[PDB]
Nucleic acid binder design. Structure first.
Ligand SMILES: [Mg+2]
Length: 137
RNA sequence: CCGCGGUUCUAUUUUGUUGGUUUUCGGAACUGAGGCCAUGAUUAAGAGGGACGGCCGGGGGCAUUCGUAUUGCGCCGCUAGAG
């Protein structure tokens, strides 16, 4: 039982943590090495009820802590990391939830593998939304 | 330019007795073979055109090739949120 494999004590098991930390949301999604099988997915939206702090560091770190206890529960010690922003033709830098989810996951008893950016980078995308005069504010 | 060949008519004579005048009479008509001309073309625009040589360029047109992205769809996984 214990919802895990028969791995030895010294040997560590690697998951893959896709962090789609965009603006207005912070996806934390731990899958296996293939990516076709997920272990746990917690988001700042499901950790807060204010609807404006869904990309906030507080909600992102709550999601990171919650997914950490699930990974330890199911028997995962190490974790590769694939950070991802909105991508496409829209913004390319990750939102505010990427950093707090990163620190909270590490400080909640987890190991870190290799960190890579997997933001979708078009060669040349379709026309962006907003018009030629942009978002007048 | 300088002469020499080569063709049609015409001012005029007086070969004053008329008639006949040669009138080539003088010159002007078309032309063949020459000599000579120092024989005859200014230079080649830091003007232009063109040719020639090697390169150069998101120049143009046609065909071909690749890229991830966006959107949608088909199977798989866990979740109540996603935007
Ligand atoms: Mg303004």
């Amino acid at each position: 039982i214990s919802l895990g494999p028969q791995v030895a004590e010294g040997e560590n098991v690697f998951g893959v943590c896709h962090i789609f930390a965009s603006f207005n949301d912070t996806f934390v999604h731990v899958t296996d090495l293939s990516g076709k099988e997920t272990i746990c997915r917690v988001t700042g939206g499901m950790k807060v009820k204010a609807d404006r702090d869904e990309s906030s560091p507080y909600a992102a770190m709550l999601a990171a802590q919650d997914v950490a206890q699930r990974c330890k529960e199911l028997g995962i010690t190490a974790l590769h990391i694939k950070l991802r922003a909105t991508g496409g033709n829209r913004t390319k830098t990750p939102g505010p939830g990427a950093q707090s989810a990163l620190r909270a996951l590490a400080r909640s008893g987890m190991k870190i593998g290799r960190i890579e950016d997997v933001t979708p980078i078009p060669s040349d995308s379709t026309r962006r939304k907003g018009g030629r005069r942009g978002r007048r504010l």
